[PDB]
Amino acid sequence: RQIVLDTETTGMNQIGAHYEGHKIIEIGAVEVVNRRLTGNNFHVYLKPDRLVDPEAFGVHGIADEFLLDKPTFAEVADEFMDYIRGAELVIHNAAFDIGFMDYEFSLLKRDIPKTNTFCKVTDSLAVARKMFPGKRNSLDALCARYEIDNSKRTLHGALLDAQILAEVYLAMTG
Ligand SMILES: Cc1cn([C@H]2C[C@H](O)[C@@H](COP(=O)(O)O)O2)c(=O)[nH]c1=O
Ligand SMILES: [Mn+2]
Ligand SMILES: [Mn+2]
Question: Which side of the chain, N or C, has fewer Cβ within a 10 Å radius?
């Protein structure tokens, strides 16, 4: 199975570990088998117990109030692991999301191993940069390059972004 994944967070750090002190607020993952979307996805919004930084809010528009009644990462971790285990994770700038995932997994104090020990990790941004050296390779740039619709992406969304990346990646490898 190939799982195309994306996450939205409360923000990120420009110095040191990018995830330190921040939290995942949305996880969006799409399943692809034999180069075909199966339709069986994973999508959750999470309660961070901290505020979303202004910069981050300017990107996804997810309000603090909307997350108050959501599950915590700890409450979705088991099913999340059951969903991704053994698959090839396809993520645009993989180190970003994997960093947050391993960070959140570590806070659970359950001795959960690193994601890349039970999942194969493919950085689709590295793949794109290799195929299109010297060109723009943001997800939006790739959407234009492969004629994928991102008109509903004024504000980024984890599932929205994962779905778009799935289409882009299938075309890139098609
Ligand atoms: C693009 C961008 C993302 N981020 C963080 C917070 C977002 O929820 C997360 C999602 O990035 P994404 O929409 O590119 O997948 O990255 C920032 O802090 N500042 C930015 O300028
Ligand atoms: Mn992303
Ligand atoms: Mn996103």
Answer: C
**Nominal resolution (angstroms):** 1.7
* Closest-lying ligand 1 atom to the alpha carbon of residue 139: 14
Please identify, in words, the CATH class of the domain defined by 1-174.
Answer: alpha beta
Nearest ligand to the CA of 8 is 1
DSSP β-bridge partners for residue 24:
9
Q: Which two tokens stand for residue 17?
A: 């570990």
CB of 104 closer than 6 angstroms to any ligand 1 atom: no
Tokens of 6: 């994306």
List the determination method.
X-ray
Joined together, the tokens standing for residue 37 give: 């979307």
Cα(128) to centroid(ligand 2), Å: 15
CB within 8 A of 173, min separation 6: which ones? none
Domain spans in the chain, listed from the N-terminal domain onward: 1-174
Judged by DSSP in three states, 7 sits in strand
